[PDB]
Amino acid sequence: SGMEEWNFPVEYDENYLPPADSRYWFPRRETMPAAERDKAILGRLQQVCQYAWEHAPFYRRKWEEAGFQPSQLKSLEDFEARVPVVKKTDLRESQAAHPPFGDYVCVPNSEIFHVHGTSRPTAFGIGRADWRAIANAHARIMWGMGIRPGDLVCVAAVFSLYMGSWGALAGAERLRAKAFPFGAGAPGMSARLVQWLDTMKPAAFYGTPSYAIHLAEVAREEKLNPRNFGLKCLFFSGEPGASVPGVKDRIEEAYGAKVYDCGSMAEMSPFMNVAGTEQSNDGMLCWQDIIYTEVCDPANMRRVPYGQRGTPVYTHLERTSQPMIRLLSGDLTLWTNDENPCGRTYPRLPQGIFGRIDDMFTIRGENIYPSEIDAALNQMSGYGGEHRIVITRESAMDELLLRVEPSESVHAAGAAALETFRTEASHRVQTVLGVRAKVELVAPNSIARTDFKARRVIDDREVFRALNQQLQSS
Amino acid sequence: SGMEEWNFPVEYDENYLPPADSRYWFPRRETMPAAERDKAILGRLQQVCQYAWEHAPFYRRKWEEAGFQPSQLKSLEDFEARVPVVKKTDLRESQAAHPPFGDYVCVPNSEIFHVHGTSRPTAFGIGRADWRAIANAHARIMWGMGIRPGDLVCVAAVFSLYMGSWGALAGAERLRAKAFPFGAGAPGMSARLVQWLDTMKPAAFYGTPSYAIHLAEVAREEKLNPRNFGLKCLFFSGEPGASVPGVKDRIEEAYGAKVYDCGSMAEMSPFMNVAGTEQSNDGMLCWQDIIYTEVCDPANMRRVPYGQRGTPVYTHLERTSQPMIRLLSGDLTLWTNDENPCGRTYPRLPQGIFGRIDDMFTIRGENIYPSEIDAALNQMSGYGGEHRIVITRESAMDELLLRVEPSESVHAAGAAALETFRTEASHRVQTVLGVRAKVELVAPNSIARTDFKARRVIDDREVFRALNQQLQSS
Numbered sequence: 001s002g003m004e005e006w007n008f009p010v011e012y013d014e015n016y017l018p019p020a021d022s023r024y025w026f027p028r029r030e031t032m033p034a035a036e037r038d039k040a041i042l043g044r045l046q047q048v049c050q051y052a053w054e055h056a057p058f059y060r061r062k063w064e065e066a067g068f069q070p071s072q073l074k075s076l077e078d079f080e081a082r083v084p085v086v087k088k089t090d091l092r093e094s095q096a097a098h099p100p101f102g103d104y105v106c107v108p109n110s111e112i113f114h115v116h117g118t119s120r121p122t123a124f125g126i127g128r129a130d131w132r133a134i135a136n137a138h139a140r141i142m143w144g145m146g147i148r149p150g151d152l153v154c155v156a157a158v159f160s161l162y163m164g165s166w167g168a169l170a171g172a173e174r175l176r177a178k179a180f181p182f183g184a185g186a187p188g189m190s191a192r193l194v195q196w197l198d199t200m201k202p203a204a205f206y207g208t209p210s211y212a213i214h215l216a217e218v219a220r221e222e223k224l225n226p227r228n229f230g231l232k233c234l235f236f237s238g239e240p241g242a243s244v245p246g247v248k249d250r251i252e253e254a255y256g257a258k259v260y261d262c263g264s265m266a267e268m269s270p271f272m273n274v275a276g277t278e279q280s281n282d283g284m285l286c287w288q289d290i291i292y293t294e295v296c297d298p299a300n301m302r303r304v305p306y307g308q309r310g311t312p313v314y315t316h317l318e319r320t321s322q323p324m325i326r327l328l329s330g331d332l333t334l335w336t337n338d339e340n341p342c343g344r345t346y347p348r349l350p351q352g353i354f355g356r357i358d359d360m361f362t363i364r365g366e367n368i369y370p371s372e373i374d375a376a377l378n379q380m381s382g383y384g385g386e387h388r389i390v391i392t393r394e395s396a397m398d399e400l401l402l403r404v405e406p407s408e409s410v411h412a413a414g415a416a417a418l419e420t421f422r423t424e425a426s427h428r429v430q431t432v433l434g435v436r437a438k439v440e441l442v443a444p445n446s447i448a449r450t451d452f453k454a455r456r457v458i459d460d461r462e463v464f465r466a467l468n469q470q471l472q473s474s
Numbered sequence: 475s476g477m478e479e480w481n482f483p484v485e486y487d488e489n490y491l492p493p494a495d496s497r498y499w500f501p502r503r504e505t506m507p508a509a510e511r512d513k514a515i516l517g518r519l520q521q522v523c524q525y526a527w528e529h530a531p532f533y534r535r536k537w538e539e540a541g542f543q544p545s546q547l548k549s550l551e552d553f554e555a556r557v558p559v560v561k562k563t564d565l566r567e568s569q570a571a572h573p574p575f576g577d578y579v580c581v582p583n584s585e586i587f588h589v590h591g592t593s594r595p596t597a598f599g600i601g602r603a604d605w606r607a608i609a610n611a612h613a614r615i616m617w618g619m620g621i622r623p624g625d626l627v628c629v630a631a632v633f634s635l636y637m638g639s640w641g642a643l644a645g646a647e648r649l650r651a652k653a654f655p656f657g658a659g660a661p662g663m664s665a666r667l668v669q670w671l672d673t674m675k676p677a678a679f680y681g682t683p684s685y686a687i688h689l690a691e692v693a694r695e696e697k698l699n700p701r702n703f704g705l706k707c708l709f710f711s712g713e714p715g716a717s718v719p720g721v722k723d724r725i726e727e728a729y730g731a732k733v734y735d736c737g738s739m740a741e742m743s744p745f746m747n748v749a750g751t752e753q754s755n756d757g758m759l760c761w762q763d764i765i766y767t768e769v770c771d772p773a774n775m776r777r778v779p780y781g782q783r784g785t786p787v788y789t790h791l792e793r794t795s796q797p798m799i800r801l802l803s804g805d806l807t808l809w810t811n812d813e814n815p816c817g818r819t820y821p822r823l824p825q826g827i828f829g830r831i832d833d834m835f836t837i838r839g840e841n842i843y844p845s846e847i848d849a850a851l852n853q854m855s856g857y858g859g860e861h862r863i864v865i866t867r868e869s870a871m872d873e874l875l876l877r878v879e880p881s882e883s884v885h886a887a888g889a890a891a892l893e894t895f896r897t898e899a900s901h902r903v904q905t906v907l908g909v910r911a912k913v914e915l916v917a918p919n920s921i922a923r924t925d926f927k928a929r930r931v932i933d934d935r936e937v938f939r940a941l942n943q944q945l946q947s948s
């Protein structure tokens with residue numbers, strides 16, 4: 001194959017740095033013919049399934065129930081058809097029956113290096129060897145974004161149970177960058193961060209796309225210009241935004257830098273297994289030799305053709321602790337397999353990930369993802385940076401209820417200017433979605449901003465009714 | 475000497491674990507005759523000063539101004555008398571004139587691994603080799619506290635600029651413990667943590683003594699018992715408390731576990747260079763072969779005899795990046811050199827560190843440290859867990875003004891029970907300090923608790939005057 005450090009269990013050279021003039025961390029693995037890589041992925045898939053059969057009673061039980069044993073894996077077609085998908089709910093029941101890490105932990109208790117989790121929540125018991133496999137995978141993908149040794153990398157997401165921050169830090173450390181783990185979550189942190197960014201001038205920033213927006217507003221309140229933070233790029237995970245039309249454009253303009261999308265799931269660390277590159281900068285590439293991504297039809301858990309939408313199903317190829325085999329994300333995306341500008345021979349998610357299928361709501365037979373609303377509003381000059389979607393899942397909705405902020409300049413322009421914006425926002429959303437949208441304007445900067453994941457949907461029946469009645473009155 | 479891995483620059487075996495039956499991580503370095511260790515410390519002090527002279531223009535300039543060159547270091551007496559102390563203000567001016575890390579960074583920019591700091595603030599540019607020297611030093615000292623490989627260690631302090639959390643995590647990682655970096659700082663974190671502690675049952679907890687108190691109150695609100703978190707110990711740094719009479723007793727009782735004191739300064743990472751051990755569990759030992767501690771008279775920066783009070787002055791023996799040579803802490807302590815129950819041949823701070831000399835205030839010619847008030851109040855059954863000291867530095871104070879919380883049970887007992895507590899608190903503080911104390915009772919749980927460092931002194935002239943006038947009225 002010629003694939004660099006290709007073995008299971010994996011064991012990377014910690015002293016390797018690619019040549020300064022190379023675009024790729026691993027030229028072979030990253031640019032080899034996709035058919036040659038798929039044969040090796042298949043080979044690895046067999047090694048992993050044999051490993052899980054031996055060390056995980058969770059997989060042994062689940063696979064026996066679905067009529068599967070690792071020997072029946074003779075092709076990628078066998079994998080999608082015979083191997084049952086793992087659900088997040090299955091991980092919970094396993095952890096409840098086999099505490100604290102479940103019957104899929106595999107490694108002995110003595111090998112566990114870090115404890116993290118979700119916030120029923122699940123605990124991540126990550127082995128020392130996997131932490132190294134995560135750090136190496138992430139340094140490689142960060143190198144792909146043009147991040148280099150000696151670059152100051154600001155990691156600005158909460159350092160707690162959440163894998164995002166730890167994952168970007170482990171990659172910064174392995175890349176021999178100057179890791180700056182400022183973190184997030186505490187009051188007063190954002191006002192302090194903009195001063196640190198102004199002084200330190202980092203080459204790269206990590207966090208959520210929502211935090212990058214809130215931070216530019218904080219920089220402005222603090223009379224600092226975020227274009228003067230010396231940023232070459234910002235790379236995000238945790239929610240949609242980095243591949244959202246007007247959202248990506250707003251962040252790139254605010255910072256005078258490039259935005260990269262990355263991130264699958266915390267259970268799927270190394271989660272940068274889906275990530276854009278410096279040249280293939282729109283959307284994300286599926287780094288197949290790190291984690292095997294399948295975009296599947298939710299009705300049968302089989303791959304959809306390229307050019308079609310489905311749900312990502314993920315498999316670890318380089319993990320011995322809590323390995324995930326066909327973990328169902330429950331998210332929606334579109335994948336293609338056209339030539340990539342960076343020359344990496346990987347499938348692509350050209351529009352990133354639209355959102356979680358469960359987050360979608362229906363209004364008059366029309367299916368709507370919150371990211372579609374965020375996209376339409378961010379492409380408007382008068383939009384103030386925040387909104388809330390007010391829905392009900394208890395009864396059918398005839399119209400979409402939006403609470404939207406106008407900009408401070410639209411507000412300063414007076415009552416007619418505010419009304420013009422409100423009617424224009426209503427029309428634009430109606431044109432994009434093909435559904436009636438009622439817009440209530442709220443005062444600039446009244447809606448809560450976040451340094452984590454934005455929760456713009458208010459699914460409360462009482463709140464929905466109160467707003468519809470209030471909008472019907474005015 | 476026989477001192478384990480004794481070289482400069484230091485380079486520890488990452489695979490070494492002491493035998494399961496050993497009390498000491500490094501038996502020689504930890505238990506050798508103090509006179510034999512002091513000759514080696516002197517030798518190392520020369521290596522460090524030669525290193526700083528060569529690589530730091532900050533030290534070259536400072537030492538030339540004080541009439542010192544490394545060749546004049548012929549004894550420990552020469553070190554205290556000839557070497558000028560470094561002040562935190564000197565570090566600031568150096569960072570302003572030579573941004574971002576100052577003219578004491580020493581290592582090339584390319585060697586910087588992590589960026590942290592204070593919150594003018596100073597930036598810490600820590601090299602890869604020093605991060606390893608910190609992790610090894612901390613695993614060694616944590617082993618001394620009885621913490622072992624495979625033990626679940628909850629690191630519950632903010633992961634941001636602050637060195638405390640990162641330092642305890644690096645030690646947990648190197649000790650091959652199950653590092654659980656939950657962190658702190660965000661709203662809702664404490665309510666979630668008590669559930670994680672109840673489920674996971676960790677062997678050890680790290681944070682501030684103030685956070686441990688607040689967390690037991692949160693565990694109780696959440697109808698959980700903190701004695702059932704399976705804790706064998708809690709180890710703290712960042713402020714006094716872990717060697718404070720009634721404070722140490724309250725935490726040990728609340729959790730049914732042992733409390734260990736550790737911590738010098740963030741500039742002095744590995745900051746566990748002052749730490750108690752499982753057997754010498756009261757106060758802290760000065761781990762002299764990691765960092766050279768001198769308890770000095772502030773009037774001349776020369777060592778005080780054992781049995782006397784002074785200010786800790788610290789020197790790195792195993793750091794190449796931002797090495798601190800005779801950094802003045804500005805804190806107050808007492809040191810002794812009697813036999814230790816663990817058998818470690820190190821000097822001791824039997825009462826830990828009293829506080830920062832600048833935090834001290836005077837009332838009618840009597841010098842008072844806030845930790846003395848905290849000690850007197852915590853030794854009272856009716857005390858509710860929080861208080862504020864209200865002072866003025868602009869004018870002379872005749873009496874001490876205290877805002878004290880009674881317990882919920884003292885409050886439920888009625889007006890006479892509240893009055894009895896208020897007068898008893900006033901008397902007790904008067905007896906301990908030998909000064910008049912005015913006590914104003916505030917409602918239970920009204921005073922802000924913290925997951926960081928407690929700021930109990932309100933030094934505002936308007937607030938002081940408003941309280942004295944209000945107390946004079948009632």
Ligand SMILES: C[C@H](CO)C(=O)OP(=O)(O)OC[C@H]1O[C@@H](n2cnc3c(N)ncnc32)[C@H](O)[C@@H]1O
Pocket residue numbers: 118162163164236237238239240241242261262263264265266267271329331352353354355356
């Ligand atoms: C640690 C990991 C990466 O931060 C993480 O966020 O895991 P978590 O369990 O907290 O959330 C995973 C979900 O978050 C969403 N997400 C995550 N990154 C994206 C994205 N780049 N585009 C769009 N949606 C995304 C998506 O719905 C994922 O299934």
Ligand SMILES: C[C@H](CO)C(=O)OP(=O)(O)OC[C@H]1O[C@@H](n2cnc3c(N)ncnc32)[C@H](O)[C@@H]1O
Pocket residue numbers: 592636637638710711712713714715716735736737738739740741745803805826827828829830
């Ligand atoms: C990272 C490091 C250790 O957490 C730290 O706290 O550094 P920082 O600059 O934030 O504060 C240092 C000061 O905090 C105090 N402190 C610190 N640990 C103690 C203690 N165990 N007993 C009493 N007072 C202490 C003392 O005044 C120190 O000079």
